[PDB]
Amino acid sequence: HMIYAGILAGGTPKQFLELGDRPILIHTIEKFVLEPSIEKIVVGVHGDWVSHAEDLVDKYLPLYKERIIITKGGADRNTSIKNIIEAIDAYRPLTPEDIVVTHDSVRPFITLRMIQDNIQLAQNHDAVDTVVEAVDTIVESTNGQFITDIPNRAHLYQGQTPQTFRCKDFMDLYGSLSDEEKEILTDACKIFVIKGKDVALAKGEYSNLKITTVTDLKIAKSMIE
Amino acid sequence: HMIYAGILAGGTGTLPKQFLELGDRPILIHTIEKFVLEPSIEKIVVGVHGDWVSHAEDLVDKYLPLYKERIIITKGGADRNTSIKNIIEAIDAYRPLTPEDIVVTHDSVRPFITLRMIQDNIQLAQNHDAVDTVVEAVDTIVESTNGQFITDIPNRAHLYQGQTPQTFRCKDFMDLYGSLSDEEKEILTDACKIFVIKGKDVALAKGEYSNLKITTVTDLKIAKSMI
Numbered sequence: 001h002m003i004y005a006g007i008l009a010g011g012t013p014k015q016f017l018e019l020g021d022r023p024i025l026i027h028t029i030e031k032f033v034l035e036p037s038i039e040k041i042v043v044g045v046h047g048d049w050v051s052h053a054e055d056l057v058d059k060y061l062p063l064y065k066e067r068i069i070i071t072k073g074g075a076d077r078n079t080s081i082k083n084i085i086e087a088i089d090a091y092r093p094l095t096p097e098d099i100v101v102t103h104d105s106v107r108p109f110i111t112l113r114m115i116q117d118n119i120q121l122a123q124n125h126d127a128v129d130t131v132v133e134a135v136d137t138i139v140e141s142t143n144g145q146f147i148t149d150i151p152n153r154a155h156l157y158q159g160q161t162p163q164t165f166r167c168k169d170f171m172d173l174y175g176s177l178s179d180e181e182k183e184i185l186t187d188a189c190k191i192f193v194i195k196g197k198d199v200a201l202a203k204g205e206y207s208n209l210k211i212t213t214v215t216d217l218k219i220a221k222s223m224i225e
Numbered sequence: 226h227m228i229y230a231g232i233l234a235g236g237t238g239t240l241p242k243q244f245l246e247l248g249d250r251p252i253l254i255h256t257i258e259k260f261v262l263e264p265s266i267e268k269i270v271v272g273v274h275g276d277w278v279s280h281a282e283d284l285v286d287k288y289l290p291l292y293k294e295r296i297i298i299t300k301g302g303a304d305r306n307t308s309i310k311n312i313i314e315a316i317d318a319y320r321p322l323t324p325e326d327i328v329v330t331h332d333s334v335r336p337f338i339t340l341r342m343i344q345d346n347i348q349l350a351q352n353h354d355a356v357d358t359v360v361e362a363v364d365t366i367v368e369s370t371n372g373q374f375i376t377d378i379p380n381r382a383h384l385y386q387g388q389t390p391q392t393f394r395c396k397d398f399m400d401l402y403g404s405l406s407d408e409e410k411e412i413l414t415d416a417c418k419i420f421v422i423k424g425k426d427v428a429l430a431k432g433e434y435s436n437l438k439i440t441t442v443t444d445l446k447i448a449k450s451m452i
């Protein structure tokens with residue numbers, strides 16, 4: 001079986017911002033290029049930014065242009081995955097056993113260690129979520145007016161990426177959902193859980209920051225001196 | 226009836242940052258300054274560690290000279306609940322508690338609280354049991370009861386990050402903290418968690434993503450850039 005990388009960069013964007021010296025997207029793709037087991041690295045880019053992602057690849061990673069496929073992502077992260085898996089299928093026809101390690105372009109501090117656990121866990125599980133023990137106190141409210149519930153904070157995890165699973169599996173489970181369900185089931189791991197599937201946990205790092213806000217940008221800058 | 230600010234501002238065992246310089250003033254000072262903005266808050270009761278009581282007194286004498294008779298320094302407890310107990314009992318020494326007297330509890334290490342947040346807490350406390358300043362979770366929260374594979378990914382749209390202010394009536398909190406045993410108090414160290422699990426109507430207050438909790442070093446670095 002093959003292993004692929006699925007970089008999600010189709011968002012609406014922070015990943016084309018310079019971090020230190022190079023775009024966050026380039027930082028993120030970098031960690032995947034060394035990994036011997038990863039066949040191609042496939043990036044879902046917003047259809048408008050595709051060409052600008054390739055100029056970026058040429059300018060910043062000319063040694064790996066062959067290892068990278070830049071493809072049009074979709075309206076929401078799940079769709080981007082669909083599109084990434086489709087592009088994988090265009091490179092080599094998917095077998096039941098081929099794998100995708102998906103990851104946010106805006107997470108530029110993922111470690112080869114994480115990547116390797118995800119790949120490694122996926123052997124004897126349906127899918128793999130990368131998480132860390134929750135820091136904030138989490139409060140629930142179905143209405144958004146008063147507290148409907150407070151979950152037990154000793155079993156809560158802050159969810160990050162990689163999210164790793166077989167390709168066919170995603171195309172099957174995601175495929176079988178009405179639009180209304182897709183709109184509610186936005187997390188890729190959620191879909192596996194509700195379909196009653198075994199999703200194991202990969203140890204993430206509190207440092208696996210996801211860069212969404214101008215505050216996240218500062219935290220990142222201080223992490224690279 | 227009365228309105229008090231209860232500033233949870235002391236303890237060890239966890240190096241907590243409330244006495245560090247932010248811009249020019251210690252963080253705690255920034256925090257107290259927000260509550261002096263509110264004309265309606267009677268006194269501002271600050272709950273510091275035993276060793277730090279006088280250090281805090283001086284900080285008021287040095288940085289808040291005029292609003293010094295507005296502020297009352299007191300000893301904290303082992304946990305913030307024991308501290309709220311101590312803040313409450315300090316107020317009862319100042320002015321005997323009237324069943325409706327509310328306390329606006331707040332982390333001393335959250336100096337970016339606005340008056341808007343404060344006023345929403347006094348207001349929402351009117352016809353609710355308690356108030357919890359809150360913001361929409363930005364992170365997907367994942368539940369796992371076993372610890373190796375997931376048992377639940379709640380809907381994120383319905384999930385919230387806890388902040389402070391947390392507001393309530395003084396007698397109301399004491400009467401619940403009482404019925405709890407010494408081993409019972411351990412399992413639920415947050416104040417709003419007591420109200421909910423003893424079935425009470427505690428409403429949400431729109432918080433702020435800028436309402437940072439200064440705990441780590443990078444947190445201090447973010448904070449310094451914000452002011």
Ligand SMILES: Nc1ccn([C@H]2O[C@H](COP(=O)(O)OP(=O)(O)O)[C@@H](O)[C@@H]2O)c(=O)n1
Pocket residue numbers: 007008009010011012013015044073074075076077078079080103104105106107186212
């Ligand atoms: N259609 C989409 C939407 C978002 N994304 C984004 O997914 C990652 C970050 O997720 P997000 O915070 O935008 O959304 P979510 O919180 O993961 O649902 C980014 O690396 C990427 O920009 C994507 O690749 N394709």
Ligand SMILES: Nc1ccn([C@H]2O[C@H](COP(=O)(O)OP(=O)(O)O)[C@@H](O)[C@@H]2O)c(=O)n1
Pocket residue numbers: 232233234235236237239241243272301302303304305306307308332333334438439440
């Ligand atoms: N007995 C205690 C213990 C800690 N605290 C802490 O509660 C406030 C915010 O919490 P923190 O940032 O120290 O973090 P933690 O809640 O102690 O994990 C601090 O101002 C103070 O150090 C308290 O008010 N009373």
Ligand SMILES: [Ca+2]
Pocket residue numbers: none
């Ligand atoms: Ca009443």
